[PDB]
Amino acid sequence: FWEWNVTWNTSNPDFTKCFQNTVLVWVPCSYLWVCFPFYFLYLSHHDRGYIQMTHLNKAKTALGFLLWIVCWADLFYSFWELAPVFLVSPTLLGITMLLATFLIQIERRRGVQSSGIMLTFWLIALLCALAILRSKIMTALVFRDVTFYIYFSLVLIQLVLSCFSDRSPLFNDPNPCPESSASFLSRITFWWITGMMVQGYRQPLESTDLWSLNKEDTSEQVVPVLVKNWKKECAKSDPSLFKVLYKTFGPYFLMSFLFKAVHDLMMFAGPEILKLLINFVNDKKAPEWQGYFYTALLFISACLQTLVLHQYFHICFVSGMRIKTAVIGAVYRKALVITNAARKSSTVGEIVNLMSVDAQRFMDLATYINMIWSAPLQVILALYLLWLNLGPSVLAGVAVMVLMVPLNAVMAMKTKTYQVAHMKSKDNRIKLMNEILNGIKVLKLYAWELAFKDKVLAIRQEELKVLKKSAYLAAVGTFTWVCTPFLVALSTFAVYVTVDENNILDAQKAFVSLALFNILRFPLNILPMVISSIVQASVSLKRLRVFLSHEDLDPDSIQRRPINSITVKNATFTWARNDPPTLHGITFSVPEGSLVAVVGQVGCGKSSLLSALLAEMDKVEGHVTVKGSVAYVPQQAWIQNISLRENILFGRQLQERYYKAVVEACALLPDLEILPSGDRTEIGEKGVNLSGGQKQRVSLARAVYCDSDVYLLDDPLSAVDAHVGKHIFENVIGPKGLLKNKTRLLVTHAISYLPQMDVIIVMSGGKISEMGSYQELLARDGAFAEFLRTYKLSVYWDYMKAIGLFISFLSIFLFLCNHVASLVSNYWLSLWTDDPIVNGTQEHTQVRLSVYGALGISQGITVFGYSMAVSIGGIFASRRLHLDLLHNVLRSPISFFERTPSGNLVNRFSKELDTVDSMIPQVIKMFMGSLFNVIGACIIILLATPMAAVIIPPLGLIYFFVQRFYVASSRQLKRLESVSRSPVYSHFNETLLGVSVIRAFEEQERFIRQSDLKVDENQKAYYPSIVANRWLAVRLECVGNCIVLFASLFAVISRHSLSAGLVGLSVSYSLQVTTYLNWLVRMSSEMETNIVAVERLKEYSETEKEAPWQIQDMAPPKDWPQVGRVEFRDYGLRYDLVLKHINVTIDGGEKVGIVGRTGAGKSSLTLGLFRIKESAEGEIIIDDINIAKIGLHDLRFKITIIPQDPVLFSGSLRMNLDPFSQYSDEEVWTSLELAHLKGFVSALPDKLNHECAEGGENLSVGQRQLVCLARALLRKTKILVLDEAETDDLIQSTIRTQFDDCTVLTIAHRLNTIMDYTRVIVLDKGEIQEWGSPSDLL
Template identity: 80%
Template sequence: MVYSPQKQIQSSNSNGEVAEEVEALIIKPSQRTAEPSLFKVLYKTFGPYFLMSFLFKASHDLMMFSGPEILKLLINFVNDKDAPDWQGYLYTGLLFACACLQTLILHQYFHICFVTGMRLKTAVVGAVYRKALVITNSARKTSTVGEIVNLMSVDAQRFMDLATYINMIWSAPLQVILALYLLWQNLGPSVLAGVAVMILLVPVNAVIAMKTKTYQSKDNRIKLMNEILNGIKVLKLYAWELAFKEKVLGIRQEELKVLKKSAYLAAVSTFTWVCAPFLVALSTFAVYVLVDKNNVLDAQKAFVSLALFNILRFPLNILPMVISTEGSIIVKHATFSWSRNDPPSLNDMNFTIPEGALIAIVGQVGCGKSSLLSALLGEMDKKEGYVAVKGTVAYVPQQAWIQNATLKDNIIFGREIKESQYKRVVEACALLPDIEILPTGDRTEIGEKGVNLSGGQKQRVSLARAVYCDTDVYLFDDPLSAVDAHVGKHIFDKVIGPKGILKNKTRVLVTHGVSYLPLMDTIIVMTDGKISEMGSYQELLKQDGAFAEFLRTYANADQEVESTGNRYVDFIILLVMFKYIGVLVLLLPVKAAMYWEYMKAIGLFISFLSIFLFICNHVASLASNYWLSLWTDDPVINGTQQHTNVRLGVYGALGISQGIAVFGYSMAVSIGGIFASRLLHVDLLHNVLRSPMSFFERTPSGNLVNRFSKEIDTIDSMIPQIIKMFMGSTFNVIGACIIILLATPIVAIVIPPLGLAYFFVQRFYVATSRQLKRLESVSRSPVYSHFNETLLGVSVIRAFEEQKRFIHQSDLKVDENQKAYYPSIVANRWLAVRLECVGNCIVFFAALFAVIARKSLSPGLVGLSVSYSLQITTYLNWLVRMSSELETNIVAVERVKEYSEMEKEAPWSIEQTAPPNNWPPEGKVEFRGYGLRYREDLDLVLKNINVSINGGEKVGIVGRTGAGKSSLTLGLFRINESAAGEIIIDGVNIAKIGLHDLRFKITIIPQDPVLFSGSLRMNLDPFDKYSDEEVWTSLELAHLKNFVSSLPDKLNHECSEGGENLSVGQRQLVCLARALLRKTKILVLDEATAAVDLETDDLIQSTIRTQFEDCTVLTIAHRLNTIMDYERILVLDKGKIVECDSPANLLQKKGIFYSMAKDSGLA
């Protein structure tokens, strides 16, 4: 059961409360007394709530500094043995009361912010809905339905985020100023040394982040995996799985090299982050004691300063978020219009594009995509903000501009002529075939007075001009829309994409082509002149917002680029799968076994070494702080402490030891993560390739690609980082408890029950929060669906005067969504308050027992103990967060293992039953009572097939659609295993031998000629078994020698994905060349010439007759004229052989074959 939020929060009431102000936004212009302002409306309505959040935040920030100040009083109390006991109890009570009050104030502040954000979003949603019901049709036509829905979903959510984070604008500077003031009071000018170290570490981390970005590999592994999964049937028929497995692993090896470099940088980053507190303390204390020998570092100064530095750490660490990595294009809060007097066309544009990035700009028609490119070019008037485009720029407009000059001059565009570069550009832009048909080639005059080019040709010339100019930044305004799908894909692959000739340039592409979006680094989604969403393809897909709306709009209209035609279906499947399967996973507990599996994948030695180094790090950290407590207890003689240099030296040495351990465990976890990633990827790849075809037929390719991309990326990058943070948080909590126990062992009585309370609270929250997230997600969709319905039927609603009923329905749906969202707000506060109360109890008992035992305790130990206890709340909160993150991300291991342990097809090779090398010597094929079904729960598709085909015999297989012709081929290659009977080839039962032992010995020329990206030679001989001479011979016999000889790279000619840069006929001849190269005793043609022209058909048939004269040839025929001279014809019908004889005899019988021949005009 989900309880309703308080009545005043519900939409019906909330909107009623703002109804008067909202009305100002939706009344007709003629009735307005002044131009309404949304900001004024919201300020008037929600101003008191923002004021309350301000007061709570200010109170909390001030109370943050009460802890260090009371700690100072407590240390002075312990130091003063004559002070009365009640003072100590008073300070303990104050410390506990302030900590509890701080907790309550902080979470009351968060509660107000989130509830105000929820009310704000509800009010905006209500206003938009009411406006939609009164807006005129002419006004409504200026925006699409999707754009108006985005107002309700994306923009309303932004108001909610604003309410939560607006106070950080003034809070962070206030915390910094107060902390610096108190530090100055405590240590004087020497505090500047520590602050300087903290500030210096910010750009260090920024540089490391930038280097990590440049080390990110833009590999082709996912692209190749996509090809493999789409062409898996061909790989299995040719027994090429191992060759392509090695190809994937080769790319993966390069990727892992890059990951290792990133791991080294991550280790340095972790080193600077973890060691920052120590480096700050060391520099401050060193300056303090070395500048003036009369400066005494007592417990009060040392531990109060440490507490203040810990407070200062958070606001200063916001700086890396502000100091972003320098980009190739930087736009900050910029607003543009077409002229000074026009209203803004682009509002509050805010983004940074890194150097070398590939960025897509998408959105509905008229949302401002082209305007954004014009703004970057300086063609629009900038009203406010900052814009910087670094380097030279090339621009490809939507409407290609062509000069009245030769085609070559249009491309060169006044630049120096470089023939090699020119040829490369012309080929990449798919202009070679066009140049060949022009009267005088590239010297042909084009433009207004010359040859009239088509729109697609003009666009490619415009694109070639930009590419030839070799600039730093490329702006493409939907250049692929003017060309057909295959040319568009060629241009993307060869020019714009991650493997194109512009791969190292900064590229901004406006596009409606959804097939290219998964390959983008970042996608910017435009809505009504604003950026509504921005992120990677996977991130935006999960949000199910404006980007998902864009996909739904354009996925169906887009051209199919993939040869299989399934890719866009996978996009829509992914859209649904992310939304619902992701929710299902949230409900399932993570198996503890997955952690053990991951440890085994890392290697037990590295796992335990990492744990050992974590322990060493925290032992060194505890020892350095304990040494500091001993240092502060040194007696003061003649106004100075003795052995200051020794104390400082040992303190520094312990810090260095800590740094070495930090670097060591960071490297161990990162390198161990790479080992695990390599092993899990190899297992996944091997087992997917070993899966039967039935697995690929029932599993969406999007799911499989997701395992190889998102899940492997999580294992590569996310899990090692989270493990480091989780382990660090765990040992921080343990370390704090050890210090507290060391100072006051009696605390051991209270820590176990507090630990149990913490554990049960955390587990209860995790289980509940999953359910609440699911309910909130499920209840959100009806709000937008109802709004969408209303927009489409607004005229009907107004005609029947049903506006009030529809407003009431909308409010009810918003309320239902709030019923799920509000408890999640409360649940978060519930968890945080209880966790911090556990931490506050530890602070209380640490201080209380220190007061009780003050006679036997030194001030240094008390300071150390209480300063650690003050941090334990932060450690506990971080531990909860990291344990939750680890639990969420370790699911990636489970998903990869799930596919690693699927059913497998028969072994590729069985040593005991392997046939001799010269098998089959004759090529005799016998089907004995053979039956086949596709799945166990389905009927037989082949029934009781009994036929014997002699070695060297040419047999045609015909039948109507669905008769079972291709099923016979699948059975012969054991793509599907037999359900009854057996197939014998030259005395060997094929079911008893390995799949590769069988498939290497028979060859197929399939109906769809599938080629893979790579060299032509690789497509003919992926194992490099044959010499170049043998390859050229096979090409000559396949009538391809002249064509391949004319290619610049000959056998090394790069085939595009699916062989798209070859014609269908050429691809089929390549498949023929494969068969000629293998020269097996049995050849199967599965309607191999159905899709080619008659000329290519004749070439293939004549080659087969001459080159496979002594081989057994089984031809599934589409064109009956190709098999009329065969020795026998098998006629299948409903999975059975109904006729089997020579063509002449079958024609005389006037059966099924006769009727088929008659239909073809052959009888």
């Protein structure tokens, strides 16, 4: 059969009769025969119960019975009587049909709602039947034909039935995951998530809307299998973790291999069909059927490749997710089991980090593993195809691609070093900014704001130098990326043309190799990432192996007996296998309900005893028989971040009477009162911090509530005061407390409660010297006596304006020029490939190469240009935005700083500014590039085929809807996952810190179950994110495949009016457009969530600012305060009025103080002098000039203040005294000498340039106060204000020494100093209670 006359070269293409009856029937039957055996593996290993008896299942089974009969009815007619094929073809078909009906039967038995096999098999059978059908209907325009019609109709109905999903098996999961219930088609197309996609677009997702996890992804089903496998390997054996990993999750992972192979083959199938189409358009006088025949082949191959690839994505990521979950669980269990000796050597941060990155590396590696063979083979295969196409010249074409792999790497590593440089400078600035943010009070008072702004600008210049260098380096980074396509094309084509003149450049020889270069880009660029990830995963394997192999505790140490209470005979314990025994000879019997105080010389082994009783020490010998539950009060109190109530409860049923008897018996009532929410307050490191004594009380309260029979109290009363300790012992530990019948064993170094103890076990270097009772031990006069004797589109326009209109417009124009250069390069290639051959060589071949080179060189330069433009633009915008934000912040009044959430300014200056200067330019570059790559593909499709504008509207609508839904619903899922990630590591830190208490109470099961919930919660948000990426993927590749199909169809329909090169270029760009579309959506999502930073940086633009610092119309004279005559004329300060009815007059050079209680307007009065808060009603005038009219800086410079706590800023002492450096060195020296500081200031090796740290931590409080006094003295102003809280004698004498000439206001909380100052003003509630000298006061 297979004669090309009727199958290939004919107007009516009909498969031959033999071919119809043999191969078209062997294909489907054969598919089920090879899959059937393999399918039992899945059907057996994976079970979900059995589906009930439904009409659908039966309908399918009955049609399977009838179909088999019909096919065997053919054998009956063939038997009735010639051709051998008229017997076997139907018989085999009947047998495979009997396998099909048996398969739906067993699939019902094994719980299968929809079958992919029973769907692909029917699809293949349908296509084969369709081919025979068309042939049989063309043969007759009766005997065995009618049997085939019946067969085809039954097969079609069977295929339609196989699409519907059956009922769920009878054998809660509120809001579950539709993955386990969706039909084969929905799983293939990932439609089941579109629900959340639409819902997320309308109702912003929360933690409870997220679907539950399928049973296999729950940590409760993936940790026990890994634990069992690791136990089996450990018991069998240097145990290897990799063998465990690929034995536990490898079988599910191996299905990725098939998908990867099919995807590679289907990816390569594209260029071959492209070559066939280019041949077809060049081959005139050829049937249209061959051209349309292929346009279908391209479409089907592209769609199938898209579907298979994402299954692989899903499969790998599922395996990686499972890997992460199982590693997390095993690490948690190991950490709860391992020995203290093996645990101390490894750092706590080492272990939390082992779960923070090492565990996740493997989860990520899942997407860089298969490439280990996909990337080489692809490349190799591609190279071979390229070698088949052009020749050895293509080696030169790729010689530059392999040259870009190291170069690009060298680029990234360098900018990493700049990343290190920039970051460093940024740290310094934020540090400086932090000092301004917490010290804005002092700056405004001295008007030193501009001086600090200058230092901020200097640090910013330092940061922008590195930013400029990184900017220039980035420009070549994009240049090479965009130039690569042209570079490889020009290099290979110029070499091909120049090497030999007989080499003809045809459309197939130029565009097929051009597309092969595109499918070579990826496998050649991911290899370094794959290798780096594999090496990091290998070091993670080593780290996890050495951790999971750690030594462990053995329950044999203590023989706990369910409730002579504590029994130890000849027991020696160690803290390590090789270290000497901490306790050599331990032998004691503690009876039930007895109080035993282990007492001894610090460094004896008291805490070791309790640790041993808890099986924390390593028992080298002996016998310990602790009887009943043990409640441990550790020396170092472990506090859970949960509320104080749940700290005391410790996962136990709340009993109001017992809880309320425990809380005050520990004297926790005052602590409950001071704490904000009472016992519901969030204690711990993260929440409210607690004093050591409060932590010990909480630990003791938790132990007392747990109601154990044996208590091990390792110094519970170390941090509680003597009265609190005695009260606690009276109501808790004493014989008349809460634990009267409980076997208490306490470690103490305090004698006060010793006589009340039943037995006192004194030790010595880990050896009991005497074991008796207080009175008996005292009578014996031995070791115990010795012890006792011991003692929004507008934000984009705002960002463009920040860059500047000129730079943005120039960048857009140059980037359009790049676009046109690339397009005309492609058009020139198309025109070049169409030249005829005369005398065995192209008519023109040198001028075409020259124009190609010129076009490409123009492309490269403008790419390097516009990239540099946005780099300069980005840096310009960063400078302008920082300057504007700094001006707005510093110009704002204090009320803004007080009222704003203190902390949202810091991340604005650090995180959002970092977002602006670095991420925004890169994102705008790549988004703009992707957008115009898509537009170029569209225009080169529409230009080459004018009548293709009917497909743009629907596909654009599909793209717009998909992009809208994805961006909206994915930037929220990412936030949910990010939020959910942290609690796992926080809980691990808590467990690591409290493991001894966790094991002592034997509540490790509860905390194991808790770590289940948090990891499951994180997975519940991570899984929808990857499925969201898959949903994007399938929708966008469907759009791209439709583009390819329509481009090829509209090129084939107009073969006469088109040339080979034009069709080739159209198809190559249409093939490329899918990746550009995907990255365009991904980049648009990146830009939407990135540009908002500018919006939050444009804040405080209109925020009410202070009065102008310099008016310059009503500026005062140089000697503004000639005498300093202050007059508060009906002053009222809004804050309802803290200051009210203030009519006072302080004469020039008259000492005046302000006295008043808390809540008066004493301090607010100073804020009136410096205009910190605008006067609600008042006319303060100094001498003959109003303050409100004067600019702020002027008055703030002519009046000085010595505040409550002097703020010393980082830098030299001279910059502290004179930030402007306006005063000469002699003045600074004189002021420092007059401030009783000459002796100290001369002592520093740096002279005046002593580098004081943040807040002057190196300097003492007295020194900082004297430095502030030195600042005030150096100012030399007639009006000075003092704010009083050892060195008081010195500062008081100094303010009384030379400032007698100047007018001094004084607000002191101490009456002793104010008595010296005449004219005291007393403020009761803002009113002037008394106005006169202290002599008139008394």
